[PDB]
Amino acid sequence: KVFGRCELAAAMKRHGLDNYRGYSLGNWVCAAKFESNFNTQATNRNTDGSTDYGILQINSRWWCNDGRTPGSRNLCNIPCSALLSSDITASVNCAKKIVSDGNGMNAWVAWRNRCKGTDVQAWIRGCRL
Numbered sequence: 001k002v003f004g005r006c007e008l009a010a011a012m013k014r015h016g017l018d019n020y021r022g023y024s025l026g027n028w029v030c031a032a033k034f035e036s037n038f039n040t041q042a043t044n045r046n047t048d049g050s051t052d053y054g055i056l057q058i059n060s061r062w063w064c065n066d067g068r069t070p071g072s073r074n075l076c077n078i079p080c081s082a083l084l085s086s087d088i089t090a091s092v093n094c095a096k097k098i099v100s101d102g103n104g105m106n107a108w109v110a111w112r113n114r115c116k117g118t119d120v121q122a123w124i125r126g127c128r129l
């Protein structure tokens with residue numbers, strides 16, 4: 001599914017991501033924009049052989065099982081395929097675990113490089129929330 005901007009902001013708020021660990025909804029929308037372009041079916045293979053999955057490009061080294069990332073963990077206790085669903089529940093629940101890990105949203109390199117310290121409230125401007 002390719003979400004609209006305000007459609008995704010609303011879905012993330014419905015699942016309790018707004019201000020989760022102190023991160024406003026515009027931070028999450030911005031991270032999803034640059035990670036996936038709001039496409040739940042986004043995938044990216046890393047040099048190390050891990051794969052990033054879904055709207056927030058969650059990685060197989062720690063967070064989900066794909067059966068093809070040697071030595072990896074599955075801390076969200078999900079198949080990585082669950083992160084590609086039209087329903088963002090699995091992505092949101094796993095994102096809450098990642099952002100609680102100690103480095104906040106710096107876990108998402110694209111958030112640190114493209115969203116951090118920007119006017120992220122622009123990402124929810126105009127949305128009926």
Ligand SMILES: [Cl-]
Pocket residue numbers: 005033
């Ligand atoms: Cl957009």
Ligand SMILES: [Cl-]
Pocket residue numbers: 024025026027120121122124
């Ligand atoms: Cl915001």
Ligand SMILES: [Cl-]
Pocket residue numbers: 065066067068069070071072
């Ligand atoms: Cl594996």
Ligand SMILES: [Cl-]
Pocket residue numbers: 073074075
């Ligand atoms: Cl595990």
Ligand SMILES: [Cl-]
Pocket residue numbers: 065066078079080
């Ligand atoms: Cl599995």
Ligand SMILES: [Cl-]
Pocket residue numbers: 011086087088089
């Ligand atoms: Cl949803």
Ligand SMILES: [Cl-]
Pocket residue numbers: 021022103104105
């Ligand atoms: Cl933090």
Ligand code: NA
Pocket residue numbers: 060061062063064065066067069072073074
């Ligand atoms: Na894994």
